[PDB]
Amino acid sequence: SDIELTQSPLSLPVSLGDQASISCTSSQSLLHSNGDTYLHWYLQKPGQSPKLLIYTLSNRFSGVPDRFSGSGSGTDFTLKISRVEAADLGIYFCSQTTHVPYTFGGGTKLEIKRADAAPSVFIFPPSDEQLKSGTASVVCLLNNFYPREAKVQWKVDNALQSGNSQESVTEQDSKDSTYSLSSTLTLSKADYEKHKVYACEVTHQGLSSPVTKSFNR
Amino acid sequence: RRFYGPV
Amino acid sequence: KLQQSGAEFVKAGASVKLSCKTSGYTFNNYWIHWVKQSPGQGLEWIGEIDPSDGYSNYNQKFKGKATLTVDKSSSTAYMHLNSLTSEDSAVYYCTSSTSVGGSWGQGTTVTVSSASTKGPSVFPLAPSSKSTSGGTAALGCLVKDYFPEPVTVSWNSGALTSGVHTFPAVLQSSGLYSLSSVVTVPSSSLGTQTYICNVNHKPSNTKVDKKVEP
């Protein structure tokens, strides 16, 4: 029965120079009997520790600009960011210290919004070198697209695959604000050699229908 | 014997 | 002005004392807190201690696991973790705060593992007709079955080899990490250059250079 703090949404794409607002919902009332409400917001930048923005509901930590604004009461709390700058990007956590033990929300990632862009899709057979070594990995690449959400599926001889693939996604790109993604299908050499057709099928917002990249061996 | 404030 | 002790790599069942050096002013005025960040459980408050008198409160969850102490003489804050487990593998922050805020440390990483270091096997992802987008070829290197983090991949040919996408490592069910590093290059360049991914795994003394030829 600890205080759970639920943030929404998970990731928030915004245009730089626009408003952003982030919600943090508390499983209980955080209003202390002294009249303060001990709900705080931090920002964590990649490879750095959390830094305080707003404390006890709506106070600015010293040097925090007022374009960062905290409000709420009871169980609903908001962080509004007013003129989103680049150095504002990263993960925002809420935290309550009203009740012991102090808790943290799961975090909201503030991202850059931009127009859709379809991925370029490429497929890579396993190297002969890897095959000699016993396994067979097939790599499917989705390069430079937006937004992040993407469905990648594997088909071997038209048989949809399950449980033999891992995806990894890059952070948002400096220059063009896109993502890239790797899907890796991992098989044993013997498995790999028994089938001819390997196809990576991709579903994404920026495409009108799914694209399938494939090779025959 | 509480601490008061942000962590 | 906070200063946290170095990374720890420890066996399960171990104990480790992490430390946090502050100023003489800090110690007198601020309270000290400890915080845990882990990929499984996110951010967690461990407990707090008032360096003025050593009085301390704890997250019920971390009673028994963590003990907090201070040493005035050296204005240093200590957190003792005992009975360590893989779930304790995390980044641990020391913080100094007040009713109006303060600052957090840079954080000590703790890794709780006895598993063997393993150097990566490095395989080319060759450029072909199926990795070409009208003018450009994509290619890469698959950096597979290593432990622990991190690797570093780098490419050759300077300026045109940026737009590199070295992907986050994925942990496999075998407990070995694996990743890919890919690049897009002008198709013409493949006749006048041979692209090479230079892979360094410090933990295992590995340096590999793999030519990625068509």
Specify the CATH number for A1-113; select among 3.30.950.10, 3.40.50.360, 2.60.40.10, 3.60.10.10.
2.60.40.10
Statement to judge: residues C106 and C191 lie in one domain: no
Per the CB < 8 A criterion, the answer to whether A107 and C42 are in contact is yes
Statement to judge: residues C149 and C164 lie in one domain: yes
Q: Do A49 and C42 touch (CB under 8 A)?
A: no
Residues in CB range of A145: below 8 A, 6 or more apart: A116, A117, A118, A119, A120, A178, A179, A180, A204, A206
Alpha-carbon span C100 to B7, nearest angstrom: 10
Buried b (16+ CB within 10 A) or exposed e, C160-186: ebebebbbebeeeeeebbbbbbbbbbe
Q: Which residues pair with A11 in a beta bridge?
A: A109
| CA closest to C105 among chain B residues | B7
Statement to judge: residues C119 and C101 lie in one domain: no
Statement to judge: residues C60 and C80 lie in one domain: yes
Alpha-carbon span A1 to A109, nearest angstrom: 27
Phi/psi at C8 (5° precision):
-115, 135
Q: Measure Cα distances from A215 to A112, A139, A203, C84, C131 in Å.
A: 35, 12, 18, 48, 11
Statement to judge: residues C1 and C79 lie in one domain: yes
Instruction: Say how many domains are in chain C.
Output: 2
Residues in CB range of A39: below 8 A, 6 or more apart: A24, A26, A30, A56, A57, A70, A72, A77, A94, A95, A96, A98
Q: Measure Cα distances from C61 to A101, A182, C47, C57, C114 in Å.
A: 9, 38, 10, 12, 25
Nearest by CB: A49 against C93, C133, C167: C93
Provide the number of CB pairs (under 8 Å) joining chain B to chain C.
23
Q: By the CB < 8 Å criterion, does A38 face chain C?
A: no
Alpha-carbon span C18 to C109, nearest angstrom: 10
Token pair for residue A17?
């120079």
Q: Resolution in A, one decimal?
A: 2.3
Per the CB < 8 A criterion, the answer to whether A66 and A53 are in contact is no
Q: Which of C114, C149, C170 is the last residue of a domain?
A: C114
Phi/psi at A88 (5° precision):
-80, -15
What is the DSSP-derived secondary structure letter of residue A12? E
Which CATH number fits the domain that encloses residue C126? 2.60.40.10
* Domains in chain A: boundaries: 1-113, 114-217
Q: Minimal Cα–Cα distance from C190 to chain B, Å?
A: 55
- Strand, coil or helix: C8: strand
Residue C192: burial class (beta carbons within 10 Å; 0-12, 13-18, 19+):
exposed
Residue ranges in A30-88 assigned as alpha helix (H): none
Q: Which of C95, C86, C90 is nearest to C109 (CA)?
A: C90
Phi/psi at A144 (5° precision):
60, 70
Torsion sign across C-alpha atoms C7, C10, C13, C17: negative
Q: Do C123 and A166 touch (CB under 8 A)?
A: no
Give all strands (DSSP E) within A2-132, no chain letters: 5-8, 11-14, 20-26, 39-44, 51-55, 59-60, 68-73, 76-81, 90-96, 103-104, 108-112, 120-124
Q: Do B1 and C55 touch (CB under 8 A)?
A: yes
Statement to judge: residues C83 and C166 lie in one domain: no
Alpha-carbon span A38 to C129, nearest angstrom: 59
Per the CB < 8 A criterion, the answer to whether A92 and A107 are in contact is yes
Statement to judge: residues C155 and C104 lie in one domain: no
With contacts defined as CB-CB under 8 Å, which chain B residues touch C45?
Answer: 7
Residues in CB range of A37: below 8 A, 6 or more apart: A30, A31, A56, A57, A72, A73, A98
With tokens 């508390």, the residue in question is A26
Q: Minimal Cα–Cα distance from C10 to chain B, Å?
A: 28
Q: Which amino acid is at A103?
A: T
Residues in CB range of A152: below 8 A, 6 or more apart: A140, A142, A165, A167, A181, A183, A200, A201, A202, A203
Alpha-carbon span C42 to A67, nearest angstrom: 27
Statement to judge: residues C13 and C83 lie in one domain: yes
Q: What is the C-alpha R_g of chain B?
A: 6
Residues in CB range of C15: below 8 A, 6 or more apart: C80, C81, C82, C83, C84
For residue C32, the number of C-alpha atoms closer than 13 Å in the C-beta half-sphere is: 34
Alpha-carbon span C183 to C200, nearest angstrom: 18
Domain A114-217's class?
mainly beta
Torsion sign across C-alpha atoms A88, C154, A126, A137: negative
Token pair for residue C214?
């068509």
Q: Measure Cα distances from C72 to A207, C24, C28, C75, C126 in Å.
A: 63, 8, 9, 5, 61
Per the CB < 8 A criterion, the answer to whether A171 and A109 are in contact is no
Alpha-carbon span C182 to A141, nearest angstrom: 9
- Strand, coil or helix: C26: helix
Q: Which of A30, A88, A70, A54 is nearest to C100 (CA)?
A: A54
Q: Which residues pair with C199 in a beta bridge?
A: C153, C208
What 3 state SS string does C70-127 have? EEHHHCEEEEEECCCCHHHCEEEEEEEECCCCCEECCCEEEEECCCCCECCEEEEECC
Statement to judge: residues C84 and C145 lie in one domain: no
Give all strands (DSSP E) within chain C, no chain letters: 3-4, 8-10, 16-21, 31-38, 42-50, 55-58, 66-71, 76-81, 90-97, 103-104, 108-112, 121-125, 136-146, 152-155, 165-166, 170-171, 177-186, 196-201, 206-211
Nearest by CB: A102 against C42, C45, C93: C45
Torsion sign across C-alpha atoms A145, A148, A149, A155: positive
Statement to judge: residues C41 and C119 lie in one domain: no
Best of B1, B2, B3, B4 to disrupt the C interface by mutation (most C CBs within 10 Å)? B3
Q: Residue A133, by phi and psi: left (phi above 0), alpha (psi -120 to 50) or beta? A: alpha
Q: Which of C114, C144, C168 is the last residue of a domain?
A: C114
Q: Do C142 and A213 touch (CB under 8 A)?
A: no
Statement to judge: residues C71 and C137 lie in one domain: no
Per the CB < 8 A criterion, the answer to whether C18 and C76 are in contact is no
Q: Which of C78, C95, C114 is the last residue of a domain?
A: C114
Per the CB < 8 A criterion, the answer to whether C34 and C94 are in contact is yes
Alpha-carbon span C70 to C33, nearest angstrom: 11
CA C94, C33, B3 angle in degrees (round to 5)?
160
Alpha-carbon span C204 to C131, nearest angstrom: 32
| CA closest to C45 among chain A residues | A102
Q: Residue C104 sits in which domain range?
A: 1-114
Phi/psi at A86 (5° precision):
-60, -45
Q: Residue A57, by phi and psi: left (phi above 0), alpha (psi -120 to 50) or beta? A: left
With contacts defined as CB-CB under 8 Å, which chain A residues touch B1?
Answer: none
| Alpha-carbon dihedral C20, C25, C29, C33, rounded to 10 degrees | -10
